[model samples]
Target chain A: DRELAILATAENLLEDRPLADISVDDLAKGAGISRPTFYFYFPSKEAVLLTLLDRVVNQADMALQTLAENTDRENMWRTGINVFFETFGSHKAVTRAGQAARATSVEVAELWSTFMQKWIAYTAAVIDAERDRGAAPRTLPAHELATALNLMNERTLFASFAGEQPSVPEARVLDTLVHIWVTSIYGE
Target chain B: DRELAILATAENLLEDRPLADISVDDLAKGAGISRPTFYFYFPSKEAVLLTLLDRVVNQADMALQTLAENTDRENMWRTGINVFFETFGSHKAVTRAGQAARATSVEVAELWSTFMQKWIAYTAAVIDAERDRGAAPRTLPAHELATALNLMNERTLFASFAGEQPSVPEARVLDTLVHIWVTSIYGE
Candidate 1:
């Protein structure tokens, strides 16, 4: 439907300016529709953002499917880390807007949390299996460890991507993140 | 003195709304000055946030002084964790605004990094001490572990506070954070 077109335009607008700074009228203008009609398609600008965020999450989830499978350890980390930076770097505008929404909107925050919880739940399962098999540290609960490490991915990736000049290069950030994950999980 | 008044008003405004949502007109009105006058004392609204961040860091650092001390092991975790939440909660407005500034302003981002580096260094010293005594795991570099955990404290706290209805209670979040810290440091 034209709702997709509106979402497309709103996502396009994020390429130029922040979601918050861009007005609903701007989104409508981009869609070549009246602001009232824009409201008809989406309740608010955030509605458009939530839609776009879903697209990003789906792509990220697809790229990280190997994470939960009992796959080879080397492939797991390599795929996991690569997909993380790839998605964030590729979807820079939407990722920046999504991070901001966690602070600004309840609906967006909840959506973002659900999106993250998918990964966290998967990571926890892997950690739990590793602990059961005597492969991972048993000091902290599997779920909590998953929470901390997964959130670090979000925070670290957001920091690196949501900057004018990344303080540390992308390669090092991924290496540091992977190192932390390996050490925390495998106690290597 | 008048500049201080404007800073105070800006801090107060953040309690009601986010820094980006509140405008110079609102700050001027809150401080009983004109919008042009508001610009006179502070070059921009973000300048007011940087000033408040300095005030917050000083007070937060004062509260967390015992963090880096050569203190006994038992009290270290309790006191350090308590002070972390206490200062962030007490300085809610500025803490909220400060984290937001990091993405939008380079100056504020550098200031925020300095603030976090202080805690990261302090935490690293303690981790290294525990490793020397064989109480903490020696698998990862103490400094790297400290950096990961300190950034968790920051990202986790900001996530909860930046929300309208916190998913977990404040006390629970602290407990989880302290658990990770203790396990990551002292082992099970």
Candidate 2:
């Protein structure tokens, strides 16, 4: 339960500030554990982040799969993208920190890559099915189209979460992404 | 022209390795200057990178301008995307290093931001013109659509250049990007 407490405390702290600003002592104190005890479950701050990310992504995958019940291609896309933004946006702090760690930490990079591969594969599969069923047009190669769209989602979300200047307005982000995914995949 | 030599040598060294791997000593030695003399030309390796990037981008801008001569929208999109890949691909070493440094270096980040701003503006203007002429369907807002398409290009190229696993095939990269651009904007 101490480990779960640490994770919950991290989620709380990350909601307010970046991982860089949070310390091991903060994690331990918020979790009602000693600083030394924090290390008993996780080796480092990044390690805790990795665990939290795993949980978030697992939950996200389940939500995404449920969207499959909607066979309408356009609505599926809209719902799927919304799920993506809301899920990741809820854990913006952990996801952003994990993105940052990917450059330096081999483990983080590997996890990130695996996550991308999984989604790209799932997206490509969906595109292929749509083509087979005469729902979407056969424009670009399915796999590559999926790759580009997913990467766009990754970049757009990073920009939005980082508060980068010149980003798409908040009100427009979801609709804009949904529109592109529909038109790019279905030839609207 | 010692400053020029430093800039030239940096470009040469970057072709073989990352900016992190290349040092001031290497830059100085490659340029036929002393280690301290490297600083005389630029403040840091990143500083030298910024200068090299400036030169590359200017040349790229000119090449991209020539692409405007093509009036066929699809043809223009294809040619323009090609120009993007070739321009950045030629300077892969420096561009990759510059991308890596963007996370930590304020100046590097600023230059990267400005570079994105310029291209997004150019792309958005073209989209707006197309809509005004009734050439392309107004799907998403021009600026946001431009932003997503441009960000896609950025992420795709970064993955390809980084040699990340599970990337889109090299042969398909150009067509896939152009396809998305044309369809997302013009509704092919």
Candidate 3:
């Protein structure tokens, strides 16, 4: 019971401090649990970070499911992309913390990579469906198109985080990104 | 004599060792000079790296000049692109080292930004000339076209180095790059 509470507290604390800066003692104190009890749940600071990441990724998957249910099946790809953007955009602090951890931590980087692979797979399925329906081009292999779209999405998103102004404002960046995705994937 | 020796030693050493691995002591020993003397000539290890980068950039400039002088004025734009790729390809190790440094080091990153600004200016000049000759599209701004070409060159070069089963051979990557450049810039 207290272990889950500690994890929840640790995740909340991460929103304020960098994952690297948040210590076991701080997490324990925040959760009103003993430091030794915190250890029962997570072995190290990195473990806490990984656990937090797992939670966020699970939440993102749930959000995607909700998005799929609410959006039109034919144009669900656009809604999925927008939902993915807004999900990360809303958790800027957590995303930035994850990025910082990713820069120097191989394990953390792998976690993000796994998330991206899943996202690409989901998007690829949509592209495949569109192609079958004659809405998207069949020229480029679907997997390759998904890979390109994923890379371009990351390049744009990371550029935004790095303070490079997108050629358009944040709201318009999605439209431009989707335009690039749709046209490039369709060979239009 | 010591300065000349150090430069020669650096150039020679660079052929075998990555710029990151070579130490000041290695440079000094290779040049038959003391470490203090090495520092006297170059303020820091980064300065040594920058000196090497400067040489590459200067050689690139000369190649551009030669391409300009020999090519018809009307064909200078495309010729410059070829020269740019050829010069960079010739010194791939140096280019790779410089790019790696730029990605990790703030001081070197600034140097890279400055280098790219100069490159954009040169590309823009060629683009403006093509515009004057009614050979290039006028829909996009010359600087914008220059930026896109710069992005294309970087993406193609990086893909050639790092992409899995790159779409074209290393030698032909530039051809694909230039094709994309011509089509995208001309709106074909």
Output the number of the TM-score-best candidate: 2
| Residue pairs in collision within model 3 | none
Stretches of model 3 off by over 4 angstroms after superposition: A1-77, A100-103, A115-132, A137-145, A165-168, B1-22, B30-32, B51-104, B115-160, B163-188
Ranking by TM-score, best first? 2, 1, 3
The CA lDDT at B187 in model 3 is 44
How close to the true structure is residue B52 of candidate 3, measured as C-alpha lDDT?
71
RMSD of 3: 5.8
Candidate 2 off by > 4 Å: A15-17, A69-71, B69-71
Q: Give i-RMS (Å) per prediction.
A: 4.6, 2.0, 5.5
Ten-residue region with minimum lDDT total, candidate 1 chain A: A163-172
C-alpha lDDT of residue A161 in model 1: 75
Model 3 Cα lDDT, one tens digit per residue, A6-70: 76777688767777678889988988888898888778877777666666667878888786565
TM-score of chain B of 2: 0.91
lDDT of 2: 0.83
Worst 10 residues of 2 chain A by lDDT: A67-76
Q: Could you tell which candidate, 2 or 3, scores higher by TM-score?
A: 2
Give the per-residue lDDT digits (tens) of candidate 1, residues B63-86.
777444435564578678778678
Candidate 2 lDDT over A1-188, as tens digits, reads 99999999998898887778899999999999998899988898888888998887877788887876545667778788887788888888888777887877888788778878988899999899989998887878787898889888988877876678657765678888887888889873
How much native contact recovery, as a fraction, does model 2 achieve? 0.66
Q: Alpha carbon lDDT of residue B103, candidate 2?
A: 82
